[PDB]
Amino acid sequence: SLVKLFTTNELMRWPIVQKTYEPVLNEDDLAFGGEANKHHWEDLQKRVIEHNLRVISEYYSRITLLRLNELLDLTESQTETYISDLVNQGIIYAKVNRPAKIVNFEKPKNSSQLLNEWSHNVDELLEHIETIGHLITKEEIMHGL
């Protein structure tokens, strides 16, 4: 479930699952080097935030920055910190308006509008004759038999 947790992660139950079942998570004495358990909370929390911003861009296209801080488990200063890191590293892309406090998806305009995006309607005009050709044949089978 931790692998599939990346699909839906609100970070609301994230500290609860780690404190309940912690075989390798919070306290791990096997196959992990370190001087203390402080590396378990730091390394695990920074990675789940990176996977958090990836799926949110594919779900919420436009969201207010005020309500965004509660879903990402971040503050006003911590929100723009992880956003700028993923853009500089070539991970994801988004829209951040400081004065407007509005976070959008920044939809690319390079699709040439009706030259590409509109071509998705070819399945609408194509399936018309396919249903008619199947209907005429189907009506004659039940009528003759």
Binding site: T8, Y60, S61
Partner: protein, 190 residues
Amino acid sequence: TLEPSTSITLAERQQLAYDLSISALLGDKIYNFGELLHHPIMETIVNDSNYDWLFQLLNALTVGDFDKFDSLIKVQISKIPILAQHESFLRQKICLMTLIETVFVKNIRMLSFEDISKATHLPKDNVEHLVMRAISLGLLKGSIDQVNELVTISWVQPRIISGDQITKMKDRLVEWNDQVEKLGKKMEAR
């Protein structure tokens, strides 16, 4: 739907529908309880002895009362929250089927948050979280408008239902035929 195959007695049809009653509880896939209404399944069984679970949740989508179905079941299937989570989808899915042709004849697809809030028995703050869980699990595809609070969906699985549905779909083809007498007659003469 198969008439010639699966030849069984009347007593085995109730036990066959018993597995169909528990199959549509925890998941929404392949239409809804209304699909078995057209097939000779729900009409061939008895409405008592806990065989009405297909009938109860069919009308419970518009009513929105969970206590009616909870009183007719046991504690085993009522202790799982998944039953109440996926039931609210079919309440919205009925509203989702209205985004093609239902009211507006201008081919304008619009769904607000208030129409799905009272039908699904869910508050306003959980509307945004409900859409995220639907797309993530592969239930539906599309996007929503968080500014004007509107919903515009993508390809779905419309049911076999008829009447008011086919009535609005045939009226659109009339508009295609009315444009033949408008734009078509002008291009034919020119």
